Amino acid sequence: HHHDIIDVNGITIDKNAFKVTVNGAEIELTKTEYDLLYLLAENKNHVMQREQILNHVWGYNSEVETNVVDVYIRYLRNKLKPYDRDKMIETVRGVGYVIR
């Protein structure tokens, strides 16, 4: 076990850097979930096609199956659900995903 959060010399450092702040609390993510959320958020109101999300989050050269995007959208929605934030991630069937 590693201490979740450490304070030393007035510096606060969390074991897991990939957290976002919501309602005075924190949602704890993985790198890939965090990068996916960032992408969608930076592209608010602009629908992102699955292949574009794949390129930006997993890499233009990636050998991963494109449906990994759908998998991680589900993981991210599940992370947002306890904070009633999941509906911000909308599916555009046959295109991709968007935050409005």
State the residues that interact with Na ion by CB under 5 A: 27-28
Q: E strands along 1-100, which residues?
A: 5-8, 11-14, 19-22, 25-28, 48-49, 89-92, 96-99
| Min dist. Cβ of residue 11 to Na ion (A) | 23
Could you say which of Mg ion, Na ion, none residue 19 binds, taking C-beta under 5 to 8 angstroms by partner kind? Mg ion
Could you say which of Na ion, Mg ion, none residue 27 binds, taking C-beta under 5 to 8 angstroms by partner kind? Na ion
The 10 Å Cβ neighbour count of residue 29 is 20
Cβ closest to Na ion, residue 28 vs residue 86: 28
Residues lying near Mg ion in the complex (CB under 5 A): 17, 19
